[PDB]
Ligand binder design. Structure first.
Ligand SMILES: [Fe+2]
Ligand SMILES: [Fe+2]
Ligand SMILES: [Fe+3]
Ligand SMILES: [Fe+3]
Ligand SMILES: [Fe+3]
Ligand SMILES: [Fe+3]
Lengths: 202, 200
């Protein structure tokens, strides 16, 4: 993902449309924030299981990608939780069980499909609802998550295509958003502009 | 997709597993080759429609990507048709879509490519192996490998939808491999040199 003159938003980007045949239940923004947290909690558990399986299967770099992406989902949960907490202090983040991890290639495909669903269906649906309800804070949070998900999808597909050609590149995760970069060739986050030196290496 | 020391095959690669919950109807290899052709004919019509829409929507580079990928599917059809014709000389290729916003078309493309690379082609490859049809295994493998490359290209384009550049998309002469830019020496799927590629 290229760095643009300004950070991408629904006001200056053209990949924020929701698939017409959406599989997402849309409620109030508060309900959507909770739904997103629930979904991301599941994603985190899935990627964590996928990472453990990848390591056992001999795919250390892919394991690191799953670990970096799980960490990215945790950042999303944090952003969403902060908003829910201000509106409903009694709200407690949910916990989920770990799902099964299968062959690494299929896990990468499962990951890619989930990321695509989140970036083109779920988050766009929630962003639209937040816009229609005037919840700018939610639009911001959902937008940041949405942008990282399509990057995650690309990273998973790249890893799938090069499943038998790994390298020593580290995956750098942004400190405040889910952006992940493979390798050292970048200066700042294309989603939030945080400098490279603030990223965490996986 | 990185160029390996060896040409990727179902024998030396580890991304040929098929999804457990398949949405593919599997029959004889002959029927599967025809099903693949029907699917690719649909894909070609789809990408051609997406390219047309992309140009009208102001995304010239993405339009070129859709055009290059449509050409890639045509190459797949050619490889599959050649085999079907041999197994049934008089076979006639079928004829066949709705286009939406550019970003959604890229996603629809990515989803179709993912289905073909992780569900359809792997299923057809295994059935061909079971029936001992080496030619079909080869054709399906070559196609399968290109589809995941197409998926990545579509997601990359989606992520940079508002940040296009002047890179050309180079399509391999005998397989569906597409490379963005001129930083490559040969096809990672069939090893054809860059000089034999067609730019889009
Ligand atoms: Fe994600
Ligand atoms: Fe394709
Ligand atoms: Fe997510
Ligand atoms: Fe960031
Ligand atoms: Fe295809
Ligand atoms: Fe090739």
């Amino acid at each position: 993902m290229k760095v643009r003159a300004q950070v991408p938003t629904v006001k200056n980007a053209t990949n924020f449309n929701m698939v017409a045949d959406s599989k997402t239940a849309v409620g109030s923004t508060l309900e959507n924030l909770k739904a997103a947290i629930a979904g991301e909690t599941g994603a985190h558990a899935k990627y964590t299981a996928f990472a453990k399986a990848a390591r056992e299967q001999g795919y250390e770099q892919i394991a690191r990608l799953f670990e970096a992406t799980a960490a990215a989902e945790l950042i999303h949960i944090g952003l969403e939780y902060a908003l829910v907490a201000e509106m409903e202090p009694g709200y407690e983040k949910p916990t989920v069980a770990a799902p099964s991890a299968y062959s690494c290639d299929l896990n990468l495909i499962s990951g890619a499909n989930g990321e695509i669903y989140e970036t083109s269906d779920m988050y766009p649906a929630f962003i639209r609802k937040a816009q229609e309800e005037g919840n700018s804070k939610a639009v911001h949070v959902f937008t940041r998550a949405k942008l990282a998900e399509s990057v995650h999808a690309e990273r998973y597909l790249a890893a799938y295509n090069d499943i038998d050609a790994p390298d020593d590149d580290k995956f750098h995760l942004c400190p405040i958003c889910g952006y992940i970069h493979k390798g050292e060739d970048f200066e700042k986050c294309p989603i939030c502009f945080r400098p490279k030196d603030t990223f965490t290496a996986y």
